[PDB]
Amino acid sequence: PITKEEKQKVIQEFARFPGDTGSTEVQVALLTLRINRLSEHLKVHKKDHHSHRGLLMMVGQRRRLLRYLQREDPERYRALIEKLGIRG
Amino acid sequence: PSRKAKVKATLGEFDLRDYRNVEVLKRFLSETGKILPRRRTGLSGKEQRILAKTIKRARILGLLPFTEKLVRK
Amino acid sequence: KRQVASGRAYIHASYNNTIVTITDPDGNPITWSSGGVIGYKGSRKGTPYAAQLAALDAAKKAMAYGMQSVDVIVRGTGAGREQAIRALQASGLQVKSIVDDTPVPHNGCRPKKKFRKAS
Amino acid sequence: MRRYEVNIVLNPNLDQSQLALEKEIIQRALENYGARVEKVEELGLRRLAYPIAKDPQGYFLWYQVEMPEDRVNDLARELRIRDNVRRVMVVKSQEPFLANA
RNA sequence: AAUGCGCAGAUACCGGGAGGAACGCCGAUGGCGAAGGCAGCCACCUGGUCCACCCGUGACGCUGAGGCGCGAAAGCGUGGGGAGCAAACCGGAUUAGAUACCCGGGUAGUCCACGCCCUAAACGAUGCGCGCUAGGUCUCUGGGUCUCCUGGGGGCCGAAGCUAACGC
Ligand SMILES: [Mg+2]
Ligand SMILES: [Mg+2]
Ligand SMILES: [Mg+2]
Ligand SMILES: [Mg+2]
Ligand SMILES: [Mg+2]
Ligand SMILES: [Mg+2]
Ligand SMILES: [Mg+2]
Ligand SMILES: [Mg+2]
Ligand SMILES: [Mg+2]
Ligand SMILES: [Mg+2]
Ligand SMILES: [Mg+2]
Ligand SMILES: [Mg+2]
Ligand SMILES: [Mg+2]
Ligand SMILES: [Mg+2]
Ligand SMILES: [Mg+2]
Ligand SMILES: [Mg+2]
Ligand SMILES: [Mg+2]
Ligand SMILES: [Mg+2]
Ligand SMILES: [Mg+2]
Ligand SMILES: [Mg+2]
Ligand SMILES: [Mg+2]
Ligand SMILES: [Mg+2]
Ligand SMILES: [Mg+2]
Structure with missing residues (x-):
């Protein structure tokens, strides 16, 4: 489970300014952290299908915010991708 | 009416997760070993849910019986 | 020919017949009976009357080893479960206790279809 | 690192030597x-x-x-490995739930 | 009733052992899940959800042909397993007959792992989302000034209204 001291590291990092907890970057970051953990869980435990539906939704919420962000600040998008190294 | 002696009244300020406590815990079992119904434990839906999870645990330790034998039938 | 004085009587109730084992206080048999032993062919055996003489037979046979008193264990839900117990009381043996003890699984094996009912 | 409770029931009749x-x-x-x-x-x-x-x-x-959590199950088995150890019940620690208090 | 088992000693009873399967009570008027579905106990891994604070982003939303995944049971493939149960089957009955219901046996199967199959009375026979329109009462689970108020969920009764009617 991702506890507070880890979730922090991420937010504090991808925040756009001290105190920002819910900006698109911070979300896409946070989600990516969750996807990656889940995909490891599912490399063993291939049989856990209920969890796999969770992941289908997280992947979907992420490609949804990116799709928005690559329309509001397409250089701020380019940067998020690079920073994570995702969607490619 | 159907209002004879209840259990929740019989005791006091007891922990509901103390599977090691027996003299308390054994008051919630049948004449046989069976776990008592709410109508006779007088526990809330949630209280009674926790009683099982512990009475069961307490059984595995060998402190509480799983079953018994009806005397005087 | 043992002189056990005290022991146990297991009544085994059933819808088809009733059988009664008498036993030394460690559970080893002394004598027994049932509705067939009494005389009855198929189908009467289960009857309450059968169980009466069944139990009486068994106790008379056990008075021979000089039993004075027994503990009663009853298993089964059959007809004449009680008549077997009544008969052991009026048997002259001293019934020191009675205990139901019909075995039941904590959901174990699939019943035969005749005992499945529904869900 | 989580809070557990290790329950252990060893054989009754030993002595302050084997025990x-x-x-x-x-x-x-x-x-x-x-x-x-x-x-x-x-x-x-x-x-x-x-x-x-x-x-x-x-x-x-x-x-x-x-x-550490990742090493609880093994600890329970290594606890179980002896023959004079008859039950091992490792439980996650929980806050009391006083009812009728 | 018979087939069947039993003097190679069964049935009943006591002690020891092996195994396969399923989890009594708690237990429903209950809960969880998108559906199929999910109940011994412990640990780890992991998904959804609800409430309070009103902190952050600033319309990022809804639906969704194709696609992709999931999908009771039965059924199939390869190994494994096999207690109980049991299609087929083998017998005993019943009957006018009885290729059935009842009775004694019993193979696949039921269980596991991996891979297929993609169905159903897969049902609330009721697509998903949002807004609006009396109340009463029972219940599960939060929060608060905790006779009660305020959320989320499960029932019942009913305003308006609807419905071919039943009903909602
Ligand atoms: Mg013969
Ligand atoms: Mg002989
Ligand atoms: Mg036997
Ligand atoms: Mg035995
Ligand atoms: Mg075997
Ligand atoms: Mg229900
Ligand atoms: Mg539902
Ligand atoms: Mg259903
Ligand atoms: Mg969670
Ligand atoms: Mg705000
Ligand atoms: Mg702003
Ligand atoms: Mg299927
Ligand atoms: Mg199947
Ligand atoms: Mg197969
Ligand atoms: Mg085989
Ligand atoms: Mg059979
Ligand atoms: Mg048959
Ligand atoms: Mg085959
Ligand atoms: Mg399979
Ligand atoms: Mg309260
Ligand atoms: Mg409601
Ligand atoms: Mg009207
Ligand atoms: Mg009308």
């Missing part, structure tokens, strides 16, 4: 698995409900401990 030997290995097997031991109760023997391992009695223990 203190198993005690040694429990203390040993606890520590060598990263378990600091917050507190302890050696609640003596007690009359069991039904007979475990052919014995109507059983000597009891209770180590309230903290330890």
Whole structure:
């Protein structure tokens, strides 16, 4: 489970300014952290299908915010991708 | 009416997760070993849910019986 | 020919017949009976009357080893479960206790279809 | 590191020799698995409900401990490996739930 | 009733052992899940959800042909397993007959792992989302000034209204 001291590291990092907890970057970051953990869980435990539906939704919420962000600040998008190294 | 002696009244300020406590815990079992119904434990839906999870645990330790034998039938 | 004085009587109730084992206080048999032993062919055996003489037979046979008193264990839900117990009381043996003890699984094996009912 | 409770029921009839030997290995097997031991109760023997391992009695223990989670199951098995150890019940520690308080 | 089992000693009873399967009570008027579905106990891994604070982003939303995944049971493939149960089957009955219901046996199967199959009375026979329109009462689970107020969920009764009617 991702506890507070880890979730922090991420937010504090991808925040756009001290105190920002819910900006698109911070979300896409946070989600990516969750996807990656889940995909490891599912490399063993291939049989856990209920969890796999969770992941289908997280992947979907992420490609949804990116799709928005690559329309509001397409250089701020380019940067998020690079920073994570995702969607490619 | 159907209002004879209840259990929740019989005791006091007891922990509901103390599977090691027996003299308390054994008051919630049948004449046989069976776990008592709410109508006779007088526990809330949630209280009674926790009683099982512990009475069961307490059984595995060998402190509480799983079953018994009806005397005087 | 043992002189056990005290022991146990297991009544085994059933819808088809009733059988009664008498036993030394460690559970080893002394004598027994049932509705067939009494005389009855198929189908009467289960009857309450059968169980009466069944139990009486068994106790008379056990008075021979000089039993004075027994503990009663009853298993089964059959007809004449009680008549077997009544008969052991009026048997002259001293019934020191009675205990139901019909075995039941904590959901174990699939019943035969005749005992499945529904869900 | 989470808070557990290690329950252990060893054989009733030993002596402060073979008993203190198993005690040694429990203390040993606890520590060598990263378990600091917050507190302890050696609640003596007690009359069991039904007979475990052919014995109507059983000597009891209770180590309230903290330890890494990823090494709890193994600790339980290594605890179980002895023959004079008859139950091991490791439980995650929880806050009390006073009812009728 | 018979087939069947039993003097090679069964049935009943006591002690020891092996195993396969399923989890009594708690237990429903209950809960969880998108559906199929999910109940011994412990640990780890992991998904959804609800409430309070009103902190952050600033319309990022809804639906969704194709696609992709999931999908009771039965059924199939390769190994494994096999207690109980049991299609087919083998017998005993019943009957006018009885390729059935009842009775004694019993193979696949039921269980596991991996891979297929993609169905159903897969049902609330009621697509998903949002807004609006009396109340009463029972219940599960939060929060608060805790006779009660305020959320989320499960029932019942009913305003308006609807419905071919039943009903909602
Ligand atoms: Mg013969
Ligand atoms: Mg002979
Ligand atoms: Mg037998
Ligand atoms: Mg035996
Ligand atoms: Mg076997
Ligand atoms: Mg329900
Ligand atoms: Mg539902
Ligand atoms: Mg259903
Ligand atoms: Mg969670
Ligand atoms: Mg705000
Ligand atoms: Mg702004
Ligand atoms: Mg299927
Ligand atoms: Mg199947
Ligand atoms: Mg197969
Ligand atoms: Mg085979
Ligand atoms: Mg059979
Ligand atoms: Mg048959
Ligand atoms: Mg085959
Ligand atoms: Mg399979
Ligand atoms: Mg309250
Ligand atoms: Mg409601
Ligand atoms: Mg009207
Ligand atoms: Mg009308």
